[PDB]
Amino acid sequence: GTILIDLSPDDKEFQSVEEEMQSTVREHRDGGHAGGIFNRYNILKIQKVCNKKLWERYTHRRKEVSEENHNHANERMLFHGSPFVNAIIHKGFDERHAYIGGMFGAGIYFAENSSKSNQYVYGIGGGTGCPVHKDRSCYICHRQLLFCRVTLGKSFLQFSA
Amino acid sequence: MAHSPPGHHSVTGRPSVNGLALAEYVIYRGEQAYPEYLITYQIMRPE
Numbered sequence: 001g002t003i004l005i006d007l008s009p010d011d012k013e014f015q016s017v018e019e020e021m022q023s024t025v026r027e028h029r030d031g032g033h034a035g036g037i038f039n040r041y042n043i044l045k046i047q048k049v050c051n052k053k054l055w056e057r058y059t060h061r062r063k064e065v066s067e068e069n070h071n072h073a074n075e076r077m078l079f080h081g082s083p084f085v086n087a088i089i090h091k092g093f094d095e096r097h098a099y100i101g102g103m104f105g106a107g108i109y110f111a112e113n114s115s116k117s118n119q120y121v122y123g124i125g126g127g128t129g130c131p132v133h134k135d136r137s138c139y140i141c142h143r144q145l146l147f148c149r150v151t152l153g154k155s156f157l158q159f160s161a
Numbered sequence: 162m163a164h165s166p167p168g169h170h171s172v173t174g175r176p177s178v179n180g181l182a183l184a185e186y187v188i189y190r191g192e193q194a195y196p197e198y199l200i201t202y203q204i205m206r207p208e
C-alpha cells in the first residue's frame with residue numbers, strides 16, 4: 001500500500017524538510033560514539049511516504065486524542081531513526097519498533113534533534129555501525145531517517161539528564 | 162509496549178543538564194505517528 005514519491009530539491013517541501021534536518025544537528029555527550037562525528041549532512045534524497053490505510057489509522061487516532069484534549073492533538077514533526085525504517089514505512093509503527101529499554105519505558109521514541117535520531121539508525125547505541133564497514137561514523141554508507149507526524153496530546157513532562 | 166501515564170497520551174523528555182539538547186518524546190500507541198518523509202543521507206566528515 002505504500003508509495004514513495006521523490007521530492008525535487010527545488011520543491012519548497014524538500015527545502016523545508018532539509019532545513020529541519022540540518023538545523024537540528026548538535027554535539028552529543030558521547031563524543032560521536034553512537035552516531036558518528038559530524039556537524040551536517042549530505043542529503044541525497046527526500047521521499048514522501050504515501051499510504052492511505054496508515055494515514056487513516058493515524059487521523060483516526062489523532063481525532064480521538066484531540067477530543068480528549070480540548071480539540072488539541074498537539075501534533076509535532078519529529079525525527080525517528082531505526083533499523084526497522086523499511087518495515088515502518090510499509091506497515092506503520094507498532095510494538096516491534098519500541099525502545100524496550102528507553103528511559104521513559106517501552107514506547108516509540110522520537111527526537112527534535114535529527115542527530116539524536118541518527119544515533120539509532122544502526123541500532124541502540126549505534127549497534128555495530130554500518131553493515132558494510134562496521135563503522136558507526138561511516139561517511140560513505142547511506143543512512144535513512146524518518147521525519148514523522150506525531151500526536152502528543154496531553155504530554156507528561158519528565159525533567160531529566 | 163508500556164502505557165502512557167494515566168491521563169496522558171505521551172511523555173516529553175525535557176533536557177535538564179545539557180542546555181543545547183532539544184526534547185525527546187515517547188508515544189505508546191503506534192497509531193499516534195505517521196512516517197511522512199523518508200530522508201536518505203550521509204553524515205559529513207568535518208573539515
Ligand SMILES: O=c1cc(-c2ccc(Cl)cc2)oc2ccccc12
Nearest residue numbers: 080081082099109110111117120185
Ligand atoms: O529516533 C529515535 C529512535 C529510537 C529507537 C530506539 C530503539 C529502537 Cl529498537 C529503534 C529506535 O530511540 C530514540 C531515543 C530517543 C530519541 C529518538 C530516538
Ligand SMILES: [Zn+2]
Nearest residue numbers: 130133138141
Ligand atoms: Zn559504511
